[PDB]
Structures are given as structure tokens and as C-alpha cells.
Amino acid sequence: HHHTDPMVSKGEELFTGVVPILVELDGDVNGHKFSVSGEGEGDATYGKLTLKFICTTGKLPVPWPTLVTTLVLCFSRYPDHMKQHDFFKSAMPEGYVQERTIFFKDDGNYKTRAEVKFEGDTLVNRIELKGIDFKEDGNILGHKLEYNYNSHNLYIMADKQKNGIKSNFKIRHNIEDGSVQLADHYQQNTPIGDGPVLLPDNHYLSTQSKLSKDPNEKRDHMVLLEFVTAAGIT
Numbered sequence: 001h002h003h004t005d006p007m008v009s010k011g012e013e014l015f016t017g018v019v020p021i022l023v024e025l026d027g028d029v030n031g032h033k034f035s036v037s038g039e040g041e042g043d044a045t046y047g048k049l050t051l052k053f054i055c056t057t058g059k060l061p062v063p064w065p066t067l068v069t070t071l072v073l074c075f076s077r078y079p080d081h082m083k084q085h086d087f088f089k090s091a092m093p094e095g096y097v098q099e100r101t102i103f104f105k106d107d108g109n110y111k112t113r114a115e116v117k118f119e120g121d122t123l124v125n126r127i128e129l130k131g132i133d134f135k136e137d138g139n140i141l142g143h144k145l146e147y148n149y150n151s152h153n154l155y156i157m158a159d160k161q162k163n164g165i166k167s168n169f170k171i172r173h174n175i176e177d178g179s180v181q182l183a184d185h186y187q188q189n190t191p192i193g194d195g196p197v198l199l200p201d202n203h204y205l206s207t208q209s210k211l212s213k214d215p216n217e218k219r220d221h222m223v224l225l226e227f228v229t230a231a232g233i234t
Contacts, residue, residue, distance in 0.1 A: 029131030047077030108134030
């Protein structure tokens with residue numbers, strides 16, 4: 001890589017080539033406790049993520065699709081003309097906090113707090129998830145969501161008061177009867193270090209994701225192939 005901006009050069013260099021990824025989540029939804037471990041790699045040059053998650057406590061008590069957004073936007077591909085707006089890489093290696101509240105329409109909500117940072121050469125996403133007010137018979141605790149995923153656009157805005165960013169966006173999960181379960185996402189990110197970060201102009205991330213299964217895997221699990229591209233600045 002080569003950019004006239006040495007702050008951009010610093011973040012891009014950490015994400016040159018393929019980077020290993022570790023994901024660790026501890027969850028509690030309506031008192032159903034569970035843990036998830038994920039591994040894979042990210043190639044930010046192509047906005048490309050490949051990850052396999054395993055529920056390490058047994059059966060996952062919520063549908064795998066509902067955890068996709070919770071389970072590393074530093075791997076988004078930012079076009080060269082937009083690399084000055086890449087908050088996620090500029091906070092590295094010290095990292096950033098990512099917090100969300102996810103309102104499932106006519107059901108409960110997830111509250112998530114995660115730290116995303118480097119441990120050596122590995123990009124680590126360590127998460128705590130708290131879910132409350134779900135219907136034990138609803139689409140989530142009742143496992144009524146199809147095992148697939150749509151493409152979305154997340155609008156990113158600066159949160160200058162907090163030296164970070166915020167976004168709110170809608171995820172739609174297909175219900176097995178042909179309907180949709182809306183998951184309204186509210187998100188904020190703040191750096192972990194004291195160093196300077198890139199505060200972006202308004203733009204968006206364009207996502208696409210494919211969920212699959214490992215045919216030789218007997219544990220409850222999800223294979224994810226995901227692409228994320230920044231856009232919206234001409």
C-alpha cells in the first residue's frame with residue numbers, strides 16, 4: 001500500500017494480507033446461558049470474512065442468524081478515496097468498543113458490548129451479550145427463523161462528542177412461514193486507546209453474507225462467508 005496520509009498508512013498496514021480472527025462470546029438470553037467461539041480469517045483488501053462459530057455450551061438457545069451482526073467491521077473494504085473515513089482500522093491495534101442494542105419487533109432485545117483489538121497477529125472480538133423480555137414461544141426462543149441472511153446497508157455517522165461513530169440500521173430475518181422478523185439495530189463505537197482516530201464523513205457499509213454448515217461438524221455451529229464494502233462518498 002501507499003497513501004500520502006501516514007495515519008492511513010498505519011492502519012492499512014495492519015490489515016495487509018490475510019489476518020487470523022478469534023471471536024469469543026458469552027451470552028445470556030432470558031437466563032438461557034451460552035457461549036460461542038469462532039475462528040477464521042479476514043482479508044480487508046477484498047472486504048472478505050470467513051468464520052466458523054461453535055456453540056461451546058451445547059445447543060444454541062437462539063437462532064444463529066440473530067447473532068451474525070454481533071459476532072469485525074475493521075475488515076470492511078474502504079475504497080482508496082474513502083480511506084480517510086475508516087474509523088475501525090484507525091483505532092487499531094489498541095482497538096475499539098462496539099456496543100449495540102438490538103430490538104426484535106414484538107419480542108425481546110439484545111444488549112451487546114464487545115472489545116475488538118489485536119492480540120499479537122490475531123484480531124480478537126470479545127463479546128458479552130444480554131437478552132431480556134423475549135417470548136419463550138416467539139420467533140427467537142422458539143427457533144422459527146430460517147437459516148439464511150440478506151444484504152444490508154449500514155449508514156455510519158461520526159459521534160464527535162465521543163471521538164467515535166454511531167449507526168442505526170434494520171436487519172430483517174426471514175421467518176419460516178414466509179414473514180420477516182425485524183431486528184432494529186442501534187450501534188456506537190469508541191476507541192480504547194487515547195490516540196487519534198479517523199472520524200468519518202457520513203457514508204455506508206454494504207454487506208452480503210452467506211450462511212452454511214460444516215457437513216462433518218456435530219456441534220451446533222455456523223459457517224459465515226461475508227463481504228463488506230464502504231460506499232456513498234463520490
